[PDB]
């Protein structure tokens, strides 16, 4: 709707140990600056917390 | 600890690397003071030392 816009993580930012990242492929974490999306591959099934 | 995760650990001269080197990646207590130098390794990553 255009209010706001997600962006890309760098590396300098991190994950928070939080959930259980079990076959993920997009989750959201707001900042103090924007919101930030991460990413993996179409296959890459994302079975573990880290990145 | 460091582990390759495919044909098991690291190596002698992997291991003496990554207490030098600047590509395989790790978690936190490793990265302040040790210099996870973050190689943004998309595919193949290099073998990741944690605790």
């Known amino acids: 709707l255009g209010m706001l816009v997600v962006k890309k ?5 991190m994950i928070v140990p939080g959930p259980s990242y079990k076959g993920k492929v997009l989750f959201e974490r707001p900042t ?3 919101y930030v999306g991460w990413g993996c591959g179409s296959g890459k099934s994302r079975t573990e917390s880290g990145e | 600890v460091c582990y390759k995760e495919g044909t098991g ?3 002698e001269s992997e291991e003496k690397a990554c ?3 600047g590509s395989c990646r790790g978690d936190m207590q490793f990265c ?8 943004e390794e998309a595919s193949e990553a290099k073998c990741r030392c944690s605790l």
Request: charge should be neutral; glycine fraction near 18%; charged fraction near 25%.
């Open chain 2, 9 to 11: 650990p690291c190596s």
């Open chain 2, 19 to 21: 207490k030098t080197s």
């Open chain 2, 32 to 39: 302040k003071v040790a210099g996870c130098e973050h190689g």
């Open chain 1, 32 to 34: 103090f600056d924007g």
């Open chain 1, 9 to 13: 993580a760098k590396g300098s930012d």
